[PDB]
Design a protein. Structure first.
Lengths: 49, 48, 60, 48, 281, 267
């Protein structure tokens, strides 16, 4: 959002899912609020990433 | 918006990423609604 | 107006990215004046959900 | 709520209709369209 | 549980159990992971006979399967030891790829060049085994599913079929398999989006040194990679560190889109090229 | 107890050289392929460090094929090795330039001769050049410095770009400072071609947006169309082969003098 890392949010996630990208897809459900902000600083800062 | 408001308010709890999964594995979406004095209930439909 | 239309169309695209996550056309239509009157309230309903802006800004 | 600070609603009347907005029908005009069977069902969002 | 004793529950033959007696060490997936299972669950075939039956739903399904290794096939008892993560296990070849010692293997749904009888269609039920491919054929066959799904976005109705047939005869090591007549399905589409988003961000992070590197190299060098890719300043390195690193977040993700689960890593291959000592589930 | 690999000393190991091998009892050993007998010419990484045109990543593509193995004991004419069981603890020897600390993930990398050129117990051109068991976050760091030096290697003719390289090979970690091509072609094919091919694919996908992320993604011949995307994805495969550094250990605790550390073996 503003402060070069955000307020780095931690999670202990349990799931029956073993596989990798099928597990990050259920995170692609949860984290759009952070993911749309992840796209934001890609254009809010040019040079800084 | 209007049809699902007209009946059946619930649209999705899952993604499109998991919407194929409910087609793949039949998942039990609706819970036991708490209004259960009789017990198990059924229905189906054929248009005449 | 192309410049005004280009800048509303850019910003009509950009606000609904925020709104769907929660962290019209012919700018000349007679009907466009109640289209603004609804869409001002469409923004007043979205500025109400995100009630936090300079005085000269409101003067500009 | 609004008193409108009544001066002459003979002329103030269509000054509203100049704008082509309508307020939502607010819980009684939206209640009359429910019928006797319709009211008691789960479809009635105005049971509260 | 680890050791899985299996009920056959069908009417098998002597010609059945003779095949598995030479197949001891094959890979069988089980969904439930009991000690006692039946052959309705044991085996992969029971889901490849679905009615939609595309590679998009079979690949995403069987990553919830649990793989086992065929042991002690005498008569009607199937010992299936569930492997543990990181012990050495030998595996008999189920698909004709020689597995090329030293590399990572994966799980391929089914041959899908027709419907192969994995053992014998016993009572109209065969026991079909997954292909265990060396992750290059796995990533490539998953690449082309999205290659030809990106193709069908901007084609009308025939230059799909004139270019899928260009790309479906996958000539790999010992195998020329076939893309399964690519069906546009939404599990591809949710992930074809994030690929197109991952291609977008690399364009953002390409900070005009990573960009112009080939286009500066063609002026100086004459290389095979450099000529085939012709057709196809700033004093801020610390910022170029972070942009290249964020670029490396994307390419470790967009590969992970089309790559599969790392699985059995080859210890040794026999000169018969059939039984392969492998570690690392 | 465990797996065993015997090494037949084709070269005569002097008792003083055995005195140096009997100091490296914990150290890792790069083996080319799992087999019970191997030559001393097989054992070690010197067969990888040897070509007029051999690049850092190509050696790393070879070492990724080489099986990591751990020294067990040196009995005179033989070296006894153990291929480590995954998940077990192993006392490996910190022969890298970096002090290890309790909880860190260790990654094997080929030793770089940039300011720290090193050999071993050498006789007849065979030494036992030993891979840098380096922490994983520094292993990705070392990789990124090598590519960015090579991406800037063509523009030596600018001194300011050369001054950008002059900062660049300075690698500084905990208690350690050290100095440090088709892979950079692979970086540039992804950088240029994704800039051009995504525009006809963002504007088509951006209408329907389930995660609500294609909206600011827009803010960010069919034969030749696929030919770009084929040689897009295959170059993405080529760089990810030489990025994902396949982590090798997890140091639980470090022995004092930082010579050794008990390391539970991972991957």
């Amino acid at each position: 959002n503003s402060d070069r890392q955000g307020r780095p949010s931690a999670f202990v996630v349990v799931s029956r899912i073993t596989h990798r990208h099928t597990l990050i897809n259920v995170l692609r459900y949860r984290f759009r609020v952070s993911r749309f902000h992840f796209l934001n600083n890609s254009i809010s800062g040019y040079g800084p990433s | 918006a209007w049809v699902r408001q007209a009946t059946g308010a619930r649209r999705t709890e899952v993604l499109d990423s998991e919407a194929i999964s409910i087609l793949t594995f039949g998942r039990k979406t609706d819970k036991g609604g708490p209004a259960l004095l009789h017990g198990q209930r059924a229905t189906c439909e054929v248009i005449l | 107006h192309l410049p005004l239309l280009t800048r509303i169309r850019q910003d009509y695209d950009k606000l609904f990215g925020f709104v769907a996550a929660r962290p019209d056309d012919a700018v000349y239509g007679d009907d466009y004046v109640p289209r603004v009157d609804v869409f001002l309230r469409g923004l007043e309903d979205l500025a109400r959900c995100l009630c936090a802006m300079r005085a000269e800004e409101v003067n500009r | 709520f609004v008193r409108e600070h009544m001066a002459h609603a003979t002329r103030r009347l269509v000054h509203f209709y100049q704008a082509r907005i309508d307020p939502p029908r607010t819980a009684n005009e939206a209640k009359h369209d429910f019928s006797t069977k319709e009211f008691a069902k789960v479809d009635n969002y105005l049971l509260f | 549980e680890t050791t899985v004793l299996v009920t056959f529950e069908q009417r098998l033959t002597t010609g059945d159990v003779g095949k598995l007696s030479r197949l001891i060490g094959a890979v069988i997936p089980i969904p439930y992971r009991h000690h006692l299972l039946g052959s309705s669950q044991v085996g992969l075939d029971a889901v490849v006979k679905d009615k939609t039956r595309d590679y998009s739903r079979m690949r995403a399904r069987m990553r919830e399967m649990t793989l086992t290794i065929m042991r002690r096939v005498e008569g009607n008892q199937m010992i299936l030891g569930v492997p543990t993560h990181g012990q050495c296990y030998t595996i008999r070849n189920t698909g004709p790829v020689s597995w090329e010692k030293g590399d990572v293997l994966t799980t391929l749904p089914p041959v899908f060049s027709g419907e192969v009888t994995g053992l014998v269609s016993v009572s109209d039920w065969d026991l079909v085994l997954p292909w265990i491919v060396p992750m290059a054929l796995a990533t490539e066959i998953n690449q082309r599913m999205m290659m030809l799904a990106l193709l069908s976005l901007d084609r009308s109705h025939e230059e799909v079929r004139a270019a899928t047939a260009q790309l479906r005869v996958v000539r790999y090591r010992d195998a020329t398999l076939t893309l399964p007549e690519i069906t546009i399905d939404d599990t591809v589409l949710i992930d074809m989006r994030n690929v197109c988003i991952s291609l977008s961000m690399i364009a953002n992070l390409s900070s005009e040194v990573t960009l112009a590197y080939v286009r500066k190299l063609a002026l100086e060098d004459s290389n095979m990679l450099l000529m085939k890719c012709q057709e196809i300043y700033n004093i801020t390195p610390t910022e170029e560190l972070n942009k290249l690193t964020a670029l490396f977040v994307m390419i470790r993700q967009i590969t992970d889109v089309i790559s599969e689960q790392p699985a059995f890593l080859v210890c040794d291959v026999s000169p018969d090229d059939k039984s392969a000592l492998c570690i690392y589930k």
